[PDB]
Amino acid sequence: SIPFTRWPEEFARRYREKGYWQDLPLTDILTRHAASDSIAVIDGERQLSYRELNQAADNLACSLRRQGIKPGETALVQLGNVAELYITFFALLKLGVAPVLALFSHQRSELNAYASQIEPALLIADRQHALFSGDDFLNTFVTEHSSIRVVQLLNDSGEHNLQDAINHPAEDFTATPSPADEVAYFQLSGTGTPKLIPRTHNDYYYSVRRSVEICQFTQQTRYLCAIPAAHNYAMSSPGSLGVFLAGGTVVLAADPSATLCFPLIEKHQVNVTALVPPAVSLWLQALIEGESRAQLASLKLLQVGGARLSATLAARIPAEIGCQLQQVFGMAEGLVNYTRLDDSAEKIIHTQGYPMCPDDEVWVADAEGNPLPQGEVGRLMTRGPYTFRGYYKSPQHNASAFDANGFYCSGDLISIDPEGYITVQGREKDQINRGGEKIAAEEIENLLLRHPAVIYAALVSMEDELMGEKSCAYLVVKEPLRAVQVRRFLREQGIAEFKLPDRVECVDSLPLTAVGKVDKKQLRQWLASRASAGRASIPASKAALREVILPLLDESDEPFDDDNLIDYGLDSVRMMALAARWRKVHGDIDFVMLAKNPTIDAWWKLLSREVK
Amino acid sequence: SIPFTRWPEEFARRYREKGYWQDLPLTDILTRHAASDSIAVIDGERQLSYRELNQAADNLACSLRRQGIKPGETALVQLGNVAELYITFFALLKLGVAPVLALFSHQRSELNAYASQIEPALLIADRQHALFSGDDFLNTFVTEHSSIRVVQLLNDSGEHNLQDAINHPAEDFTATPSPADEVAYFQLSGGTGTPKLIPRTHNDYYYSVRRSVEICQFTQQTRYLCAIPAAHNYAMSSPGSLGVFLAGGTVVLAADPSATLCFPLIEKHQVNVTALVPPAVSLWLQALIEGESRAQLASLKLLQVGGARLSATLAARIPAEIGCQLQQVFGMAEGLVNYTRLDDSAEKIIHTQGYPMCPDDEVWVADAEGNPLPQGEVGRLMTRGPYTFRGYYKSPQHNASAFDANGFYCSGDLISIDPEGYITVQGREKDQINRGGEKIAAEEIENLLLRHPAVIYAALVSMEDELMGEKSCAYLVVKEPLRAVQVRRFLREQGIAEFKLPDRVECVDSLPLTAVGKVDKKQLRQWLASRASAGPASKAALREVILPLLDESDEPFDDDNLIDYGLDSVRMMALAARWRKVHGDIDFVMLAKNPTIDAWWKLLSREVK
């Protein structure tokens, strides 16, 4: 068996006796439809029956078994939004092989990290991925991961051609899924080392079943998959696995641009899709800028999740797109909260839903680690029938990631409604949520420190209108580095392109801890007092004052030194702010003083005085 | 009797029975504390006890009676955050004269407008007001409003000296307040092209004060800092200074809600409650973050925020950065005031604007056709109740369009109601700017504009401002071109409140006109988003477009990978959607395969095929 942290016996029995764990493999999602001719997968021009989908999975599993792949073993897969992802996935389940489905965005350091951990016998990737265009990386990778005995490549026309395996008809094949209470596959986690989440058939099949129920997926569902298909969101909430379980149709898209997706939604009459907020921002702008909503008329449900949706953006969706919103707050660790189809337009705009299972136990903790009453803000704790009880082979990290009662901390600050619902309030874990992709501050900092000129490094999130958050790397350096240089360096480290720092700030020093690392939990306050210290400098010339004043007033006109600044749109609150700062030098300056004579002349007269 | 719209008989009767209307005059707020030596008012270095407050009020009313003022008559007052405002107010209730309390920032246009309506016997004002420094304005105003027989001036050393009157001891004086079911005074609307007046009776208005005190638990230990405009209904009655007076506490007055004035005042006097508008919260928060000690605000236990929308982000910061409970206050001078409760969860307080203060505040949510909506749906605020007016003063035409058949008023706000009944404002329907809590009517500002010779069409709309909440933008089509400073100056020459001068002015070629002469605003919003929607010529022009999207730091070569300069994929996807309308073969994929200025220029510069 593959090592994972089991639920304690009383919980396993409880979950089994309640019917959350049904003891069926995940392969059951497909094989129940193994004779259906209705369409399961649409990928560009290609369409697969359910019966085609199952046959192909059977075929691939058989081909892999003929090449010496065995049950209990492990696989590394890098396939993006293509039909083969699902064929591969069920093929491995049928074979009883446990896959890690890497992001198509993942590069050499991610692929090495996953491979090192699972010791994979099987590697399936895609010659359309830049690492796999030629054969040089593949040669090194297999050499450096000697467990790898078989390699199958999409878009290849040689001995490793994945299409061959998939097209070769099974011959006396019996599926051998791993037991339902054992690992089915490894999910990815959002620390400086990639952490894997073992999922069992029981916990994961439950998370999908219950999602199908809540979202009412049916044979009639036509679901657009345009975010990354391998992510838990797109795979299971209810995602494409939900669609398959319901006997519906999955429509695949390379990316969630409006350009690509709008005509697909019309062509195939998508009624449900899952987006991340930047993509939502994108679709709204496209319509306002001319795109026809009529293309999206068939659309019945837009899922938004992965990141914090503003009430304002949340609210434009029925109004502008023309369909229901569902907020979905979820995590690969387990817990998924949905709003409901029968929720009020009120509940749907402001809250992130409540847990999909009634045995999902969630409780807001404080820093001491105490339950707070309903309505108070703090740490999210949780265990349940589909929340794991331990990262793959990480006992030290698990000792720190769970409480005494086996509750897992999600690193999310939340408040619970009177009525059960959850509204996300903040985060305490150290990560950037860049448009839905998670970045470990720890990981990026170690790579930055690898550069000769970098001595100290800190990665923090900054707000961005489209992306939600972005990365900011502060650096203390031996020699000045351009941001383009830092991004170039990290590219060379073979890391995913979204992990490239969005801004770089070189600085002369940074708050340090004891071990010689950067003190982040003051870098909060340290940063604030640097920005507010340049803004505390009282101008030393009339010119320097003009420089502070102009950006506060109207862009259109530029005033004369003796002009009434209010006639150029200087508002009284900004005036009050200036007063509060200048009073720190001349302590007789207040709002009333400035407002009596609101000109640069008169303010320079005051400002240029000697401190008395 | 001063003309106003009575509540129906069944309503009046019900309101008395349930205890809402008590049939006490507003003066009872003071006279119930007339032997109390406890401090009622602190204005700079001056302190007035309750018995003094009452005494001064009696003195003023007595003098005004000596100079010929009679109950039933009306009064125009412009006094800002001074102790005299309360002394005056209570003197006028005692005499039974009904004031309009103007804003200290109100100028010549607003003052002529209120006077025009109330036909005032009495004018009181402040020589510290630029209109009243000398006697030029005062001389015209009195002449242009002949009803005025008596003028009294704060900061004056002549016969019109307000302090002479306040200091002259009362003789043979007994109060003659107007009957409790009649107008006590006129409150100002948000606003229409004409300033509207809200007649408040001693019954409905006292009730809003009493019930507000119960909710915010004001008592004799309450020490309320009044630093926003004291005459406004918020600072005056929600529970405001009248609440403080009712509960026997202390009002501490300030001229403005800046931190540097206010922080010291809260420490020195151990102020425990205060009422802010959102910009002033942003203001106090920044001063602290930039060095002001929070120890100065230790005594502070409650902070009211209202008048405009408070964001949840800002709301969440208050208990954490100021160290006192937050209370959201959604009120209108028409009546309805909702409050969050002291025993609310932090969740409730942050996200909601509270529920109504009165059990018989009937609030429902109407769709645009006028039909009720299920709890939790979004729409128009309809409301009536025992302290919500039934009509503006002498405005039968407007009142017909302002109330529905059953006497529900329409606040012009967009709201949703959560299960528990809490209210969250979702938007606004009426045509006004909410500029840090001061209400600007677009209509009013537009007629003034159209009076400028170069101006042929005008539209005032609101725009977001991180600090003020909303600012004002004036779109004009004009004969000869106008600078913003010219427009603001011209408006000043019209004598309007400074806050009503347009924050922005964009001159434009044309404007969507209403089919009946004016400018179409509910088409202007979408006219606007489709005028700026239009907006690459050369490689140079492409470059002009790309750079602001990428990293501000470095500058790229034409063959550089723009992702190495931090151009994210969503901005890239958006660029594609835009460029597809010319070259119908461009998608995100095409742009991303080769993200350079050179490659993109090559594609853009192709002939359309």
Coordinates of C-alpha atoms in Angstrom, one line a residue, chain B residues 127-427:
Chain B
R127 CA -19.8 87.6 11.6
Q128 CA -17.1 85.0 11.3
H129 CA -19.0 83.9 8.2
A130 CA -17.5 85.6 5.2
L131 CA -21.0 86.7 4.1
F132 CA -21.4 88.5 7.5
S133 CA -18.0 90.1 8.2
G134 CA -19.2 93.4 7.0
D135 CA -22.7 94.7 6.3
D136 CA -22.9 94.5 2.5
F137 CA -24.6 91.1 2.4
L138 CA -26.6 91.5 5.6
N139 CA -28.0 94.8 4.2
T140 CA -29.3 93.3 0.9
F141 CA -30.5 90.0 2.5
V142 CA -32.6 91.8 5.1
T143 CA -34.0 94.1 2.3
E144 CA -34.6 91.3 -0.1
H145 CA -36.4 89.4 2.7
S146 CA -38.8 92.0 4.2
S147 CA -40.3 89.6 6.7
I148 CA -37.1 89.9 8.8
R149 CA -37.6 92.3 11.7
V150 CA -34.8 91.0 13.9
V151 CA -31.2 90.1 13.3
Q152 CA -28.7 88.7 15.9
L153 CA -25.1 88.1 15.2
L154 CA -22.4 86.0 16.9
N155 CA -19.0 87.7 17.1
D156 CA -20.6 91.1 16.9
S157 CA -20.1 94.2 19.1
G158 CA -23.2 96.2 18.2
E159 CA -26.9 96.0 19.0
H160 CA -27.3 92.9 17.0
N161 CA -24.8 91.3 19.4
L162 CA -26.1 87.8 20.1
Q163 CA -24.2 87.7 23.5
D164 CA -26.1 90.7 24.7
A165 CA -29.3 88.7 24.3
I166 CA -28.0 85.4 25.7
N167 CA -26.6 87.3 28.8
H168 CA -29.7 89.4 29.6
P169 CA -31.6 87.6 32.4
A170 CA -35.1 86.4 31.6
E171 CA -38.1 88.4 33.1
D172 CA -41.7 87.2 33.4
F173 CA -40.9 84.3 31.0
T174 CA -42.8 81.2 30.4
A175 CA -42.3 78.9 27.5
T176 CA -44.8 78.8 24.7
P177 CA -43.6 75.8 22.5
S178 CA -45.7 74.9 19.5
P179 CA -48.1 72.0 20.3
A180 CA -46.2 68.7 20.3
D181 CA -48.1 67.5 17.2
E182 CA -47.0 70.5 15.1
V183 CA -43.7 71.5 13.5
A184 CA -40.9 72.1 15.9
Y185 CA -38.4 73.0 13.2
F186 CA -37.3 72.4 9.5
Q187 CA -34.7 69.9 8.6
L188 CA -32.8 69.9 5.3
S189 CA -33.2 67.2 2.6
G190 CA -30.4 65.5 0.7
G191 CA -32.0 66.7 -2.6
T192 CA -34.1 68.3 -7.1
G193 CA -33.2 71.7 -8.6
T194 CA -34.6 73.5 -5.5
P195 CA -33.6 73.0 -1.9
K196 CA -36.3 71.0 0.0
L197 CA -37.3 71.4 3.6
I198 CA -38.5 68.7 6.0
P199 CA -41.0 69.8 8.7
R200 CA -40.3 67.8 11.9
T201 CA -42.9 67.7 14.8
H202 CA -42.0 67.6 18.5
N203 CA -43.7 64.1 18.5
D204 CA -41.9 62.4 15.6
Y205 CA -38.5 64.1 16.2
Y206 CA -38.4 63.6 20.0
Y207 CA -39.1 59.9 19.4
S208 CA -36.2 59.6 17.0
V209 CA -34.0 61.1 19.7
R210 CA -35.3 59.0 22.6
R211 CA -35.1 55.7 20.8
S212 CA -31.6 56.5 19.5
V213 CA -30.4 57.0 23.1
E214 CA -31.8 53.7 24.1
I215 CA -30.0 51.9 21.3
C216 CA -26.6 53.5 21.7
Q217 CA -27.1 53.5 25.5
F218 CA -26.3 57.1 26.1
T219 CA -26.3 58.1 29.8
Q220 CA -24.9 60.9 32.0
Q221 CA -21.5 59.4 31.5
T222 CA -21.7 59.8 27.7
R223 CA -19.1 62.3 26.5
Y224 CA -19.9 62.8 22.8
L225 CA -17.5 64.6 20.5
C226 CA -19.4 66.6 17.9
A227 CA -16.9 67.4 15.1
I228 CA -18.9 66.9 11.9
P229 CA -21.6 69.6 11.2
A230 CA -23.6 70.0 14.4
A231 CA -26.8 71.2 12.6
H232 CA -27.1 68.0 10.5
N233 CA -29.6 65.4 11.5
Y234 CA -26.8 62.8 12.1
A235 CA -24.8 64.9 14.6
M236 CA -28.0 66.5 15.9
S237 CA -30.2 63.5 16.7
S238 CA -28.8 60.1 15.9
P239 CA -28.6 60.1 18.9
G240 CA -26.5 63.2 18.4
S241 CA -26.2 66.2 20.7
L242 CA -29.9 66.0 21.5
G243 CA -29.4 62.4 22.6
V244 CA -26.6 63.5 24.9
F245 CA -28.7 66.3 26.3
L246 CA -31.6 64.0 26.8
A247 CA -29.4 61.5 28.7
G248 CA -27.7 64.2 30.7
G249 CA -24.2 63.9 29.3
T250 CA -21.7 66.3 27.8
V251 CA -21.3 67.5 24.2
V252 CA -17.8 68.4 23.3
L253 CA -17.7 70.5 20.2
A254 CA -15.1 70.7 17.5
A255 CA -14.8 72.8 14.3
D256 CA -13.8 69.9 12.1
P257 CA -13.2 66.2 12.3
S258 CA -9.4 66.4 11.5
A259 CA -7.3 64.2 13.8
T260 CA -5.0 67.0 15.0
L261 CA -7.9 68.9 16.4
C262 CA -9.9 65.8 17.6
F263 CA -7.3 63.4 19.1
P264 CA -6.3 65.9 21.8
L265 CA -9.9 66.7 22.5
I266 CA -10.7 63.0 23.1
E267 CA -7.9 62.6 25.5
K268 CA -8.2 65.9 27.4
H269 CA -11.9 65.3 28.0
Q270 CA -12.0 61.5 27.9
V271 CA -14.5 61.4 25.1
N272 CA -16.2 58.0 24.9
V273 CA -18.3 58.3 21.8
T274 CA -18.1 60.3 18.5
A275 CA -19.7 60.2 15.1
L276 CA -17.8 60.2 11.8
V277 CA -18.2 60.1 8.0
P278 CA -16.0 57.7 6.0
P279 CA -13.4 60.1 4.8
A280 CA -12.8 61.3 8.4
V281 CA -12.3 57.6 9.3
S282 CA -9.8 57.3 6.5
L283 CA -8.3 60.4 7.9
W284 CA -7.9 59.2 11.5
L285 CA -6.7 55.8 10.4
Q286 CA -3.9 57.4 8.4
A287 CA -2.7 59.7 11.2
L288 CA -2.4 56.7 13.6
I289 CA -0.5 54.6 11.1
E290 CA 1.8 57.6 10.6
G291 CA 2.6 58.1 14.3
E292 CA -0.3 59.5 16.3
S293 CA -0.7 57.4 19.5
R294 CA -3.9 55.4 20.0
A295 CA -3.5 55.9 23.7
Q296 CA -5.1 59.4 23.0
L297 CA -8.3 57.5 22.0
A298 CA -8.2 55.0 24.9
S299 CA -11.4 56.4 26.5
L300 CA -13.2 56.1 23.1
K301 CA -15.7 53.2 23.4
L302 CA -18.1 53.8 20.4
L303 CA -17.5 55.2 17.0
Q304 CA -20.5 55.9 14.8
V305 CA -19.9 55.9 11.1
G306 CA -22.6 57.0 8.6
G307 CA -23.8 59.4 5.9
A308 CA -22.1 57.5 3.2
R309 CA -21.0 53.9 2.4
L310 CA -18.4 52.4 4.7
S311 CA -16.4 49.6 3.0
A312 CA -16.0 46.4 5.0
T313 CA -12.3 46.7 4.7
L314 CA -12.4 50.1 6.4
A315 CA -15.0 48.9 8.9
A316 CA -12.8 46.0 9.9
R317 CA -9.9 48.3 10.6
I318 CA -11.7 50.4 13.3
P319 CA -11.9 48.1 16.3
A320 CA -8.4 46.8 15.5
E321 CA -6.6 50.2 14.8
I322 CA -8.7 52.6 17.0
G323 CA -9.6 50.1 19.7
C324 CA -13.3 50.7 20.0
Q325 CA -16.6 49.2 18.8
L326 CA -18.0 50.2 15.5
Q327 CA -21.6 51.3 14.8
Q328 CA -22.9 51.8 11.3
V329 CA -25.6 54.3 10.9
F330 CA -27.7 54.5 7.8
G331 CA -30.0 57.5 8.2
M332 CA -31.9 60.1 6.2
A333 CA -33.3 63.5 7.2
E334 CA -36.6 62.2 5.9
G335 CA -36.7 59.9 8.9
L336 CA -35.5 56.3 9.0
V337 CA -32.3 55.7 10.9
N338 CA -30.9 52.2 11.1
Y339 CA -28.2 51.2 13.5
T340 CA -26.0 48.2 14.1
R341 CA -26.2 47.2 17.8
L342 CA -23.7 47.3 20.5
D343 CA -24.2 43.6 21.1
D344 CA -23.8 42.8 17.4
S345 CA -21.2 40.3 16.2
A346 CA -18.1 41.8 14.5
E347 CA -19.4 40.1 11.4
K348 CA -22.8 41.9 11.4
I349 CA -21.2 45.3 12.1
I350 CA -18.6 45.1 9.4
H351 CA -20.8 44.1 6.5
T352 CA -24.2 45.6 7.4
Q353 CA -25.7 49.1 7.8
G354 CA -27.9 47.9 10.7
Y355 CA -31.7 47.5 11.1
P356 CA -34.4 50.2 11.8
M357 CA -34.6 51.8 15.3
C358 CA -38.3 51.4 15.5
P359 CA -40.3 48.2 15.4
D360 CA -42.9 50.0 13.3
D361 CA -40.5 51.4 10.8
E362 CA -42.0 49.6 7.8
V363 CA -39.2 49.0 5.4
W364 CA -39.8 47.0 2.1
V365 CA -37.8 46.6 -1.2
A366 CA -39.5 47.6 -4.4
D367 CA -38.6 46.6 -8.0
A368 CA -38.7 49.3 -10.7
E369 CA -42.3 48.5 -11.5
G370 CA -43.1 49.1 -7.8
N371 CA -43.6 45.5 -6.7
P372 CA -42.4 44.0 -3.3
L373 CA -39.4 41.6 -3.4
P374 CA -38.3 38.6 -1.3
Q375 CA -35.9 39.0 1.6
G376 CA -32.4 39.1 0.3
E377 CA -33.2 40.5 -3.1
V378 CA -31.9 43.8 -4.3
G379 CA -34.0 46.9 -4.9
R380 CA -35.5 50.3 -4.0
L381 CA -36.1 51.4 -0.4
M382 CA -39.7 52.2 0.5
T383 CA -40.4 53.2 4.1
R384 CA -42.9 54.9 6.4
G385 CA -43.1 55.2 10.2
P386 CA -43.6 57.4 13.3
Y387 CA -40.6 59.7 12.6
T388 CA -40.6 59.6 8.9
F389 CA -42.1 62.6 7.3
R390 CA -45.2 62.6 5.0
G391 CA -44.1 65.5 2.8
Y392 CA -41.6 68.3 2.2
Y393 CA -42.6 71.9 3.1
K394 CA -45.0 73.6 0.6
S395 CA -44.1 71.1 -2.2
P396 CA -47.4 69.4 -3.2
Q397 CA -46.1 68.6 -6.7
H398 CA -42.9 67.0 -5.6
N399 CA -44.6 65.1 -2.8
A400 CA -46.9 63.4 -5.3
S401 CA -43.9 61.9 -7.0
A402 CA -42.1 61.3 -3.7
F403 CA -44.6 59.1 -1.9
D404 CA -46.6 56.2 -3.1
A405 CA -50.4 55.7 -2.7
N406 CA -50.0 54.3 0.8
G407 CA -47.6 57.0 2.1
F408 CA -44.4 55.1 1.6
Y409 CA -41.4 57.4 0.9
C410 CA -38.8 56.4 -1.6
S411 CA -35.3 57.1 -0.4
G412 CA -33.7 56.6 -3.8
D413 CA -31.3 54.1 -2.3
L414 CA -30.8 50.5 -3.4
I415 CA -30.8 48.1 -0.6
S416 CA -31.0 44.4 0.2
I417 CA -32.3 42.8 3.5
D418 CA -30.6 39.8 5.1
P419 CA -32.7 37.2 6.9
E420 CA -32.2 38.7 10.4
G421 CA -33.6 42.0 8.9
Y422 CA -30.3 43.8 8.7
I423 CA -29.9 46.3 5.8
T424 CA -27.1 46.6 3.4
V425 CA -27.1 49.5 1.0
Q426 CA -26.4 48.2 -2.6
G427 CA -26.5 51.4 -4.6

